[PDB]
Amino acid sequence: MKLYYSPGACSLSPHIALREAGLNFELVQVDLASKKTASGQDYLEVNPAGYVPCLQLDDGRTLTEGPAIVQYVADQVPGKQLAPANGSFERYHLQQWLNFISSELHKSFSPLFNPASSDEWKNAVRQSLNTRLGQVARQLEHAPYLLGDQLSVADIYLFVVLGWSAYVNIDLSPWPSLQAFQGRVGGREAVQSALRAEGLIK
Amino acid sequence: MKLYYSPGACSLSPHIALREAGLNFELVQVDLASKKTASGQDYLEVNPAGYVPCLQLDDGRTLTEGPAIVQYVADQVPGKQLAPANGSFERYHLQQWLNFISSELHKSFSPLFNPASSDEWKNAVRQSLNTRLGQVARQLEHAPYLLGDQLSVADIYLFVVLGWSAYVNIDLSPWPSLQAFQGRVGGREAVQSALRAEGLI
Ligand SMILES: N[C@@H](CCC(=O)N[C@@H](CS)C(=O)NCC(=O)O)C(=O)O
Ligand SMILES: N[C@@H](CCC(=O)N[C@@H](CS)C(=O)NCC(=O)O)C(=O)O
Ligand SMILES: N[C@@H](CCC(=O)N[C@@H](CS)C(=O)NCC(=O)O)C(=O)O
Numbered sequence: 167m168k169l170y171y172s173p174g175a176c177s178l179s180p181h182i183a184l185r186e187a188g189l190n191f192e193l194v195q196v197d198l199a200s201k202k203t204a205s206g207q208d209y210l211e212v213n214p215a216g217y218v219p220c221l222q223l224d225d226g227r228t229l230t231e232g233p234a235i236v237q238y239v240a241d242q243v244p245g246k247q248l249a250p251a252n253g254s255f256e257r258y259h260l261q262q263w264l265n266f267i268s269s270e271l272h273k274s275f276s277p278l279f280n281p282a283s284s285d286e287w288k289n290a291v292r293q294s295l296n297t298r299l300g301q302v303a304r305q306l307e308h309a310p311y312l313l314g315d316q317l318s319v320a321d322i323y324l325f326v327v328l329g330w331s332a333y334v335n336i337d338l339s340p341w342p343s344l345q346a347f348q349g350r351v352g353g354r355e356a357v358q359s360a361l362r363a364e365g366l367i368k
Numbered sequence: 369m370k371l372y373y374s375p376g377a378c379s380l381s382p383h384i385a386l387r388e389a390g391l392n393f394e395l396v397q398v399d400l401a402s403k404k405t406a407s408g409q410d411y412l413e414v415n416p417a418g419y420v421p422c423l424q425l426d427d428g429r430t431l432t433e434g435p436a437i438v439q440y441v442a443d444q445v446p447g448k449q450l451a452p453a454n455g456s457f458e459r460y461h462l463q464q465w466l467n468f469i470s471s472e473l474h475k476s477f478s479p480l481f482n483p484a485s486s487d488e489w490k491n492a493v494r495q496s497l498n499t500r501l502g503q504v505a506r507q508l509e510h511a512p513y514l515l516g517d518q519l520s521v522a523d524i525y526l527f528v529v530l531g532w533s534a535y536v537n538i539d540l541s542p543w544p545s546l547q548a549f550q551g552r553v554g555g556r557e558a559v560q561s562a563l564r565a566e567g568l569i
Contacts, residue, residue: 215468215503229461230464231463231471232467233467234461238457241455255429258436258437265433265434265466265470268471269433269470269475273471282492284486287485287486287488290485301416304416
């Protein structure tokens with residue numbers, strides 16, 4: 167199982183999930199600049215959309231889109247409840263959160279990270295991110311995790327997006343519950359191993 | 369169940385999936401302006417996010433995000449195969465497409481619908497669509513649906529999304545495979561029923 171990734175990108179979510187699940191995997195760095203995998207092969211042959219993450223099973227099948235990959239990873243180790251059982255209400259609830267993070271949070275940072283982005287665009291999204299983040303913050307005051315007391319891949323995904331905040335000057339102090347969450351998820355060794363592994367910390 | 373929708377919006381996807389699954393439901397329009405259901409109720413009480421769709425089970429429980437809602441709907445009548453079986457690779461492959469349409473297509477269209485967005489904003493996102501729409505078009509070139517021969521909820525979501533390409537002047541003639549897809553999904557009774565019901569006459 168190979169994970170095409172880039173240090174610090176959204177691919178850190180499935181990365182952490184892989185460590186949390188304890189599967190067999192290999193991190194394959196993709197040059198987002200040149201679009202070549204570690205082997206210097208054209209990544210677009212793997213993901214024509216050109217982005218990461220991308221999971222590649224040893225048999226050759228690939229899977230893209232963070233939310234899809236982390237659910238596949240989770241379903242490999244049901245014992246470690248990183249996703250409610252399929253068919254159960256909480257599974258659709260997990261899928262609800264995963265999409266929310268993807269559509270309503272992740273994509274709202276993308277314009278910030280891009281220089282070409284006009285301020286009259288980078289601001290139109292910061293406002294939104296403020297609104298969305300407040301919603302998440304309130305969800306995290308109730309219980310420790312998104313789905314309650316049980317951690318899921320949604321939390322890992324969210325944890326990752328919350329990490330870019332600092333890079334784009336987004337303050338999370340307004341929401342203490344978000345900070346308590348970050349310290350709570352970042353406190354897991356799988357999480358620390360991934361940060362260390364991506365050269366993000368240490 | 370109740371489906372909080374708005375005519376033509378992306379709530380049209382779960383609406384079609386509902387009819388396709390042969391599941392009966394009640395439509396509850398939501399004034400995306402006032403954020404009040406058709407009963408005056410404050411929609412932000414239902415969805416703090418303020419957007420449709422929102423599926424409310426008979427339980428009284430609720431669900432948001434198109435991709436989740438349509439997967440719940442699909443799994444209710446597996447006999448209709450609106451989604452590959454859970455635990456099957458193609459099910460994750462389906463979710464791959466649902467997240468793609470949501471973040472790589474649906475949210476690209478959002479800006480093109482807002483007037484309070486810089487003129488340069490729409491330009492950038494218009495190329496993204498051309499890039500992504502090109503990949504989807506290529507997907508449906510040698511196969512009728514996103515996952516092959518069997519129509520899934522992913523195709524329904526895509527159908528609704530492309531339907532907006534008119535209101536935003538995104539000619540699809542460059543992508544005949546998309547015009548075919550559109551003409552294909554659009555001819556389904558469940559589709560035309562949802563249109564008629566949403567008053568899209
Ligand atoms: N919809 C995709 C988005 C993936 C994505 O945006 N990946 C970024 C990294 S965070 C990327 O590699 N973009 C291509 C690039 O920057 O060249 C998903 O949820 O997985
Ligand atoms: N009813 C429209 C299509 C529906 C539509 O306009 N959807 C809009 C908002 S209701 C949309 O693309 N929303 C994307 C977004 O807000 O992100 C038509 O077919 O003429
Ligand atoms: N992330 C949501 C997107 C839903 C969405 O953007 N809905 C639009 C219409 S298609 C909306 O209701 N926007 C709020 C408004 O128009 O007031 C999902 O995947 O379901």
